Design a protein around this ligand. Structure first.
Ligand SMILES: *Cc1c(COP(=O)(O)O)cnc(C)c1O
Ligand SMILES: *Cc1c(COP(=O)(O)O)cnc(C)c1O
Lengths: 379, 376
């Protein structure tokens, strides 16, 4: 570890300038990022259009934008546009899928599985087994391969990037291992979409608008391969359904904020326009710089290996400080936005809570140093 | 009577974007005021400045004011009120949480997707007695519920497919006398009918008569009932300590739209609920008078129904859906076409629905009547 300087990318500056000026310092795009002026305007415009021509007329007329959003998402995950459906977010997504699941309801997932995912799993009558992982919580693909062949399961649920830790999971290799054992794979890409390469052959993928794609809140996407989709049995309407519609049409049924969905379509568009690979390489870099700058802070140790290709960095207190209090202090006294991850976020992995930073492409080394500095003089 | 001059109507029109053509469809989706649109935009901007959840925390006063306004309209407490994605979200949250024996009675004109949610949640559904208009007969219902009791009564106080105002208050006390709680679907009724009627739970949608943003609804449950409920998510066997209402309000949502909504209900209170409702009743009367004499269409609602919903049944087998498309494409007039699926146990034939808000004029109603005559 001989420190390395930051790459200069105009991407960072373009991205900062495309969105409102931050009041203080925002290191929290893993919780909720920042909508561009274009995304905010497109949302506002739809709401105005609803008033001028009627809400549903407006919605019909927005079909091109909506479909473009499906198509953009589809391209990032290697699906077809018509496999992609809108939701309220990722927890909505997993519930739609698991509540629709036919036959034996068993699955395997990581021990670091997201608390509310486990909640949805249990609530849908699933039996849940842990996959083998190393000390960082990263799946051991070979071991998992053998385990799944001997002791199969109805599906594997992989959270490719966890909310509580910035480890990038070997999604692609695990997918082919599961497919070799004849088991479909669902991916929670709430953190991963717009961040990791999510084109990995999965059978279903879901994600949230408001995180790395910097879309409006209250939107998510769920993508399901046609072979799987047609096997599914939605909860509403009941399977003796007089109205004839496809599974995906049923899963997309319901009042929603249409303006926010067109907002989202603009946001994914901005990601494609910026260059997915370039954005991801930059986020990997942000993580490296973060872990380098924060390597030497009294009372905090960096959890992630330095070279993890993610922008999520988590800090564990070494003298029993409470992340939640530090976050409140950082906001109130320094205007620095972070997230405090409680144990409930990953109850079968986390033994102690952590402070999480999740900066986007626009963060500077100076800003990371300001955070480090503020973290030292915290009471 | 007829051409009442009401300043409310003009203020309401001018507080919102100019309509392109003619909008008679506030029962499907109304029109957000500039203030509501701006408040929504502002929250989204604030999320970008200070962080999404920081912004959400800071918006608590507005959000709580929205709960309090809703509470005042239904005669509940603010802390009984929870936000949802809409009314179908609401009914599902409630029915999926319902403890013990799952039986209910509802109207035959019950909303199709309500029946869907009922069936999906394992409820047995019995019809309430009604007159020829689909309006509940409270005395008969009283006897029926005493003889054959049920876990709850679900009343849609104003239907999507017909502008009959149900005697909610009378039915509520009849059910309470039989010891049976009452849930009210006030998607159409809130901001429209007096919804302060002693119900045990009430829900509604933002985008209709209150002219709020889409993707927001409210669900209100009395504390005695709320604490008996057993939410689906998280599972009841789970460790996380939160109230029932906290559980039902759990989830990613558009926070900006909720503050938008709080502004919208505020505008309703500010305008005077009673005055707005009296004006909507008037709009219905005028609509049915103007449309009384149209070839190929009969008016379904009695003229004096205190609602702004008027429905038209074709007398020579015209298809409402096609007429709606024509009206939009060729005349710029926005209506809704109600298919049988909207009330499958009442509707024998589909209908064209108009649902104008307070701002409609007699002239505009005549233009609609005229356009309806020269429709192919
Ligand atoms: C954000 C998050 C979720 C939940 O997403 P919502 O949009 O809030 O439902 C699930 N998975 C992970 C990894 C998360 O970070
Ligand atoms: C609009 C409507 C609903 C469903 O409302 P959503 O917000 O679309 O869920 C339910 N009841 C009636 C009377 C309706 O008209």
């Amino acid at each position: 570890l001989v420190p390395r300087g930051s790459h200069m990318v105009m991407l960072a500056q373009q991205w900062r300038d495309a969105r409102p000026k931050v009041a203080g310092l925002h290191l929290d795009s893993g919780a909720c990022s920042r909508q561009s002026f274009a995304v905010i305007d497109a949302t506002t415009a739809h709401a105005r259009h609803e008033a001028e021509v009627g809400g549903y007329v407006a919605a019909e007329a927005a079909t091109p934008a909506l479909d473009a959003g499906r198509a953009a998402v589809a391209s990032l995950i290697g699906f077809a546009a018509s496999d992609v459906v809108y939701t309220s977010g990722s927890n909505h997504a997993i519930d739609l899928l698991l509540s629709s699941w036919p036959g034996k309801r068993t699955l395997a997932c990581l021990p670091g599985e997201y608390g509310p995912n486990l909640s949805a799993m249990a609530a849908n009558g699933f039996q849940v087994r842990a996959l083998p992982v190393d000390d960082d919580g990263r799946v051991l693909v070979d071991e998992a391969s053998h385990e799944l062949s001997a002791h199969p399961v109805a599906l594997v649920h992989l959270t490719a990037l966890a909310s509580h830790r910035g480890i990038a999971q070997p999604a692609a290799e695990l997918v082919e291992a599961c497919h070799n054992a004849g088991i479909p794979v669902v991916i929670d890409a709430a953190q991963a979409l717009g961040h990791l390469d999510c084109n990995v052959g999965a059978d279903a993928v879901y994600s949230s608008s408001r995180k790395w794609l910097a879309g409006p809140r209250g939107v998510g996407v769920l993508a399901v391969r046609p072979e799987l989709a047609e096997r599914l049995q939605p909860r509403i309407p009941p399977s003796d359904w007089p109205i004839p519609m496809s599974v995906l049409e049923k899963l997309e049924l319901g009042e929603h904020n249409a303006a926010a969905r067109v907002g989202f379509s603009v946001a994914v568009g901005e990601h494609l326009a910026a260059g997915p690979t370039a954005v991801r390489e930059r986020l990997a870099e942000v993580g490296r710089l973060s872990r380098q700058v924060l390597a030497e802070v009294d009372g905090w140790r960096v959890v992630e290996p330095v070279d993890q290709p993610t922008a999520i960095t988590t800090l564990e207190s070494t003298d029993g400080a409470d992340p939640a209090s530090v976050r409140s202090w950082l906001i109130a006294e320094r205007g620095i936005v972070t997230t405090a991850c409680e144990l409930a976020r990953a109850p079968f992995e986390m033994r102690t809570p952590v402070l999480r930073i999740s900066p986007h492409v626009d963060v500077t080394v100076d800003e990371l140093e300001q955070f480090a500095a503020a973290l030292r003089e915290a009471p």
